[PDB]
């Protein structure tokens, strides 16, 4: 998937060999789907003002590269929580979680009032990968189109391993005739 990964990186990069970082803590990247950082995840007043009903923490954990939240954190707020203890490394098999994450986003959006924040530490690699996979798996977008729409609404940069996993997913969905031409 080297060529395919490189094609995706070419859509993300700034043409100096660099990738823009997020200019805001949180963005609505497609209708009722928000991607954001640790700061917004831990700011319940802000979440309530955006009308967030569901939070998917794609960086759950105790290190400086994780967000140390849990169901308890959200208990009084009426927000439904799911955590995935992912690491942002090329070796981490985030694709094992694509179904679970896509199901959680579907659970949130199935009711018309639902709004989901999918967040990680920076809203840059882990959480955008899960949103892109959801758009592919549930909205029949090919990876290039899905990545492009998310990148138009938030500066993202999934690590090359995550991008390879998305390319593998795209191959499978395209093969099975589940993507829109």
UniProtKB/Swiss-Prot annotation:
Q: Pfam family example for this protein?
A: DSPc
GO BP: cellular response to epidermal growth factor stimulus; dephosphorylation; negative regulation of cell migration; negative regulation of chemotaxis; negative regulation of epidermal growth factor receptor signaling pathway; negative regulation of ERK1 and ERK2 cascade; negative regulation of JNK cascade; negative regulation of MAPK cascade
Principal localization reads: nucleus
| Keyword Cytoplasm on entry | yes
- InterPro entries from the UniProt entry: Atypical_DUSP_subfamA, Dual-sp_phosphatase_cat-dom, Prot-tyrosine_phosphatase-like, Tyr_Pase_AS, Tyr_Pase_dom, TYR_PHOSPHATASE_DUAL_dom
SMART domains this protein is in?
Answer: DSPc
Q: Does the keyword Cytoplasm apply?
A: yes
The residues responsible for catalysis, as annotated, are: 120 (phosphocysteine intermediate)
E.C. designation(s): 3.1.3.16, 3.1.3.48
Q: Which reaction does it catalyse?
A: O-phospho-L-tyrosyl-[protein] + H2O = L-tyrosyl-[protein] + phosphate; O-phospho-L-seryl-[protein] + H2O = L-seryl-[protein] + phosphate; O-phospho-L-threonyl-[protein] + H2O = L-threonyl-[protein] + phosphate
Tyrosine-protein phosphatase domain: residues covered: 24-175
Which Gene Ontology terms of cellular component type are present? cytoplasm; cytoskeleton; cytosol; immunological synapse; motile cilium; nucleoplasm; nucleus
Q: What class of enzyme is it?
A: hydrolase
Matching PROSITE patterns: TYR_PHOSPHATASE_1, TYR_PHOSPHATASE_2, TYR_PHOSPHATASE_DUAL
What are the protein's GO molecular function terms?
cytoskeletal protein binding; MAP kinase phosphatase activity; phosphatase activity; protein kinase binding; protein serine/threonine phosphatase activity; protein tyrosine kinase binding; protein tyrosine phosphatase activity; protein tyrosine/serine/threonine phosphatase activity
Keywords in alphabetical order: Cell projection, Cilium, Cytoplasm, Cytoskeleton, Flagellum, Hydrolase, Nucleus, Protein phosphatase
Report the subcellular localization.
Nucleus; Cytoplasm, Cytoskeleton, Flagellum axoneme
How would you summarize the oligomeric state and partners of this protein? Microtubule inner protein component of sperm flagellar doublet microtubules. Interacts with VRK3; this interaction activates DUSP3 phosphatase activity.
What does this chain do?
Shows activity both for tyrosine-protein phosphate and serine-protein phosphate, but displays a strong preference toward phosphotyrosines. Specifically dephosphorylates and inactivates ERK1 and ERK2.
Q: Which family does it belong to?
A: Belongs to the protein-tyrosine phosphatase family. Non-receptor class dual specificity subfamily.
Q: What is this protein called?
A: Dual specificity protein phosphatase 3
Classification of source organism? Eukaryota, Metazoa, Chordata, Craniata, Vertebrata
């Amino acid at each position: 998937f080297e060529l395919s990964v490189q094609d995706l990186n070419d859509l993300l990069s700034d043409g100096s060999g660099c990738y823009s970082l997020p200019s805001q803590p949180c963005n609505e990247v497609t209708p009722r789907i928000y991607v954001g950082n640790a700061s917004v995840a831990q700011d319940i007043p802000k979440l309530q003002k955006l009308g967030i009903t569901h939070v998917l923490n794609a960086a759950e954990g105790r290190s400086f590269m994780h967000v140390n939240t849990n169901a308890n954190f959200y208990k009084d707020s009426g927000i439904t929580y799911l955590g995935i203890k992912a690491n942002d490394t090329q070796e981490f098999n985030l694709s094992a979680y694509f179904e679970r994450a896509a199901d959680f986003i579907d659970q949130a959006l199935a009711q018309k009032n639902g709004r989901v924040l999918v967040h990680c530490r920076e809203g840059y690699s882990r959480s955008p990968t899960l949103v892109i996979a959801y758009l592919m798996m549930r909205q029949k977008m090919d990876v290039k189109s899905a990545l492009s729409i998310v990148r138009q609404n938030r500066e993202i940069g999934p690590n090359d391993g995550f991008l390879a996993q998305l390319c593998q997913l795209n191959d499978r969905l395209a093969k099975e005739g589940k993507l829109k031409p």
